[PDB]
């Protein structure tokens, strides 16, 4: 591999900050550095090439330095839509070259998750499993404890989280917790609760329901 | 306007073969250098191969040569990545690119990408379940409802709401691998709570691998 | 191994020889371009006339056409054809005036 | 009849090519002389590297000897042997500094 | 010091052959351009041929090619002009030269020359007759005497006096062609008239073609 | 023939005069003009080359002009030893080139021939021819009538002249007249006379003898 060393691997910065990702090339002259922006589950979009030049229609807030082997993508006024993984690429002799990457994210004013619980649908019980969904909608930052309690009895390893990728306009997250169990097992308890803890939420919040109210 | 449009990704028993295709339009692939660059789940970019028709000159990343053969057909203005002898670690989103001397070797048009997934596991079709809005879905004047897409394979699955007319407040969750080796996700949407009863809400799920198209309506309860 | 005199003389006397010309020369105000390759192999008049008052120059010529990559930096690129001058016969004429 | 691109590129890329060098160059303060022929056919590094930041230059070399007529105007003349530098292998190295 | 020394000229029936030789010394004929340039009686110069050994390159004047072949032997440092098929108008003094680039193509060393004469006429040896000093040879205190060289062929003939010791006042006349086709000349010398009787006077004639060497003494009369 | 046009074909000039022979070349540039000096019955000697340059040991009184196609050998102070035939030669592309030539001769103060007559030798009569030699020694100019008269009877076409080539120190000539006849014919006359006429000799001079006094 014609090496390229990208740093930092990931970073945060409040809106309007001077963010600067950097890269470190192999042992050749070779000014053929490009930078790409990869939004989640989506094709890389070219930004800058030969280290300084700027692909068409790319915003004025991106620039780059070609100074020995030390290259720098530089976002003057970071924006709420600039959340992505930026990859660099020294491409003069070959393409076998791609920086490790940098997940940029926005830092912002503390958001509180609103919590919602969903007892399992009637028909899912008709087939004999029972999934109970929790939903911490639109919060920040990513970190948050959801704990399941069935009749105050903590569960473990029958649940499963998934986390929305940062919102490109308002920079919040969302997370689903999903408790899953046999229909039989669902019948032998009453209280199903979901216990959300969050940094910007002083009092560990609980949303719950009795089977089957209502 | 230039675009690259790839197709052919799917599910393949290990040791089998697929043929990825990169249809170009708005420029001759003949005149340019066309690449395949892949991305395994959650990891970064790995160049796989490239063809430059004008020069008659191809290349292969160490990990892939012998098995894959890149190729082009400039009458159809399409490139191709025939992969044989496929492996678990080959599993990725295959992306195709365009490199040129004009943009100083930089890769300036990429396709949307197909997903190649190399597993022994069976194609399964998901099950759609309404996540009904209750009073336990309510916070102020807003009320969250959704759709649980349970137990499917391979990826991926499309979820839209009221056939595309409802985009705002929708969060479609990244799929998760359950113990079983099967994916699952929910798409939830936050709405005004005055509209429950006046305005119907249908989630449109689509899991093309298993010919599963589902249009489930979500209403409140008794 | 020694090159014999008449063999040197015969081989170095004014004649058409495969030469490698830059394309910027052969194409004048095409600076809205870069070429690949940047030069091309043309037969061209070369060697000497064994004399200071004599220069080697083309008397017969002939056009050859070539597949060249005409890059236009920051817009795009395409393979086109590009004819160049080729010397078919040489002659030791008197230095210009 | 059209030269195909890869064939042009292969033929014009930095490599050793029969070139015709003046002897005054290869032999510096020998101005108490005139040569016949005044130049000689030496293999030498030529063509381009398809790039402005790269020059074509010798990495391997090898001496050849040649029967040359060393005239010394107004005194006399004699055939002697005269070695010249010959490029056996070329390489596209980076422009000097 | 450089010199060119030619030999081999003589008498030849028309249609016969001779071999002229140009021995060089004090420089390599190899390194230079060696010429043959001839001169018919009383006329000017006509280049005949030339060789440049270093180049392996010869040349022939239109009037001579096909029959003559110039050649060199650089171990003997000698050049050669083999002439065949010889003619009356070929008859001349053959001269050999040296041309170089040093002296800007100019011909800077020439040999003394041999005489080639192409005739059907017989070699004849001359007759030497004293031209005696009389009172009709006297003018003031000087008195002319000589030697008549009569009827010979081909040319030439050498005349010296007292074996070389007497050079002053000597006039050796240009030969003349008599009706017969035979040459003839006199060498006369003017001397002090006090010396007649004290100082012997012998003319040394030499006509090498006819093996004629004559040493005739010239005395006054009764 | 790569032409060269020499003029004059022959010329005279008193000692110390400014003599100048000229030549006219073919249709090429070509500065390879040489000049040679040919003394009678003798190898050409090189004088000047490339038109101006001067072979070693050649006297300072010779020079040359290379001016278009018009070349000029030039003898500043002509000398009594400069009598010869000078040939030019344009030799750049080939030697097939030689001027027609120029017999230079000295002009000088009128010299008178001294006349001498030689009756035939005894032994020449022993074999039966009879040659009678006349000798106009050291005169100028070349032209001169010698007339044979045997008993005042003019002869013709049994005589024969030869003329010394100009003397290289004192610029005079010499001439032998040679009357030749049968022994029989020699016996039947008495007076053999030789009648020298010359420009610098007012009175047509006669040298003679009676056979066989003495």
CSV table of C-alpha atoms in Angstrom, one decimal, chain C:
chain,number,residue,atom,x,y,z
C,1,UNK,CA,34.8,-3.8,-30.8
C,2,UNK,CA,35.6,-0.6,-32.8
C,3,UNK,CA,33.3,1.3,-35.2
C,4,UNK,CA,35.1,1.7,-38.5
C,5,UNK,CA,35.4,5.2,-40.0
C,6,UNK,CA,33.3,4.9,-43.1
C,7,UNK,CA,30.6,3.1,-41.0
C,8,UNK,CA,30.5,6.1,-38.6
C,9,UNK,CA,30.4,8.6,-41.4
C,10,UNK,CA,27.6,6.7,-43.3
C,11,UNK,CA,25.5,6.4,-40.1
C,12,UNK,CA,25.9,10.0,-38.9
C,13,UNK,CA,25.5,11.8,-42.3
C,14,UNK,CA,22.4,13.9,-42.7
C,15,UNK,CA,19.4,11.4,-43.1
C,16,UNK,CA,15.9,10.8,-41.7
C,17,UNK,CA,16.0,9.3,-38.2
C,18,UNK,CA,13.4,8.4,-35.6
C,19,UNK,CA,13.3,11.4,-33.3
C,20,UNK,CA,11.0,12.2,-30.4
C,21,UNK,CA,9.3,15.6,-30.7
C,22,UNK,CA,7.4,17.5,-28.1
C,23,UNK,CA,3.8,18.2,-29.3
C,24,UNK,CA,3.7,21.7,-27.9
C,25,UNK,CA,6.3,22.5,-30.6
C,26,UNK,CA,4.3,20.9,-33.5
C,27,UNK,CA,1.1,22.5,-32.3
C,28,UNK,CA,1.4,26.2,-31.5
C,29,UNK,CA,-1.3,27.9,-29.5
C,30,UNK,CA,-2.8,24.6,-28.1
C,31,UNK,CA,-1.9,25.6,-24.5
C,32,UNK,CA,-5.6,25.1,-23.6
C,33,UNK,CA,-4.4,21.4,-23.6
C,34,UNK,CA,-1.9,18.9,-22.2
C,35,UNK,CA,-1.0,15.8,-24.2
C,36,UNK,CA,-0.5,12.1,-23.4
C,37,UNK,CA,2.0,11.2,-24.4
C,38,UNK,CA,3.4,14.7,-24.3
C,39,UNK,CA,5.7,13.8,-27.2
C,40,UNK,CA,5.5,11.6,-30.3
C,41,UNK,CA,8.0,9.6,-32.5
C,42,UNK,CA,8.5,11.3,-35.8
C,43,UNK,CA,11.1,10.5,-38.5
C,44,UNK,CA,13.2,13.8,-38.8
C,45,UNK,CA,16.3,15.2,-40.3
C,46,UNK,CA,19.5,14.6,-38.3
C,47,UNK,CA,23.3,14.3,-37.9
C,48,UNK,CA,25.7,16.6,-39.6
C,49,UNK,CA,27.2,17.7,-42.9
C,50,UNK,CA,30.9,17.5,-41.8
C,51,UNK,CA,31.2,21.3,-42.1
C,52,UNK,CA,30.4,24.5,-40.3
C,53,UNK,CA,29.0,26.2,-43.4
C,54,UNK,CA,26.3,23.5,-44.0
C,55,UNK,CA,23.1,22.5,-42.3
C,56,UNK,CA,20.9,19.4,-42.6
C,57,UNK,CA,17.3,20.2,-43.8
C,58,UNK,CA,14.1,18.5,-45.2
C,59,UNK,CA,13.4,18.4,-49.0
C,60,UNK,CA,10.7,15.7,-49.0
C,61,UNK,CA,8.0,15.3,-46.3
C,62,UNK,CA,4.9,13.3,-45.5
C,63,UNK,CA,2.1,13.5,-42.9
C,64,UNK,CA,1.5,10.7,-40.2
C,65,UNK,CA,-1.6,10.6,-38.0
C,66,UNK,CA,-1.6,9.5,-34.3
C,67,UNK,CA,-4.1,8.6,-31.5
C,68,UNK,CA,-3.4,11.2,-28.8
C,69,UNK,CA,-5.0,11.9,-25.5
C,70,UNK,CA,-6.0,15.6,-25.5
C,71,UNK,CA,-6.4,16.5,-21.8
C,72,UNK,CA,-7.9,19.9,-21.0
C,73,UNK,CA,-7.2,20.4,-17.3
C,74,UNK,CA,-10.2,21.0,-15.0
C,75,UNK,CA,-12.8,20.4,-17.8
C,76,UNK,CA,-12.1,17.0,-19.3
C,77,UNK,CA,-10.3,14.7,-21.7
C,78,UNK,CA,-10.7,12.7,-24.9
C,79,UNK,CA,-8.7,10.6,-27.4
C,80,UNK,CA,-8.5,12.4,-30.8
C,81,UNK,CA,-6.3,12.1,-33.9
C,82,UNK,CA,-3.4,14.5,-34.5
C,83,UNK,CA,-1.3,14.7,-37.6
C,84,UNK,CA,2.5,15.5,-37.5
C,85,UNK,CA,5.1,16.4,-40.1
C,86,UNK,CA,7.6,13.6,-41.0
C,87,UNK,CA,10.8,14.0,-43.0
C,88,UNK,CA,11.2,11.4,-45.8
C,89,UNK,CA,14.3,12.7,-47.4
C,90,UNK,CA,17.2,15.0,-46.3
C,91,UNK,CA,19.8,17.1,-48.0
C,92,UNK,CA,22.8,19.2,-46.9
C,93,UNK,CA,21.8,22.7,-48.2
C,94,UNK,CA,23.7,25.9,-47.4
C,95,UNK,CA,23.2,27.7,-44.1
C,96,UNK,CA,20.4,30.2,-44.3
C,97,UNK,CA,21.9,33.3,-46.0
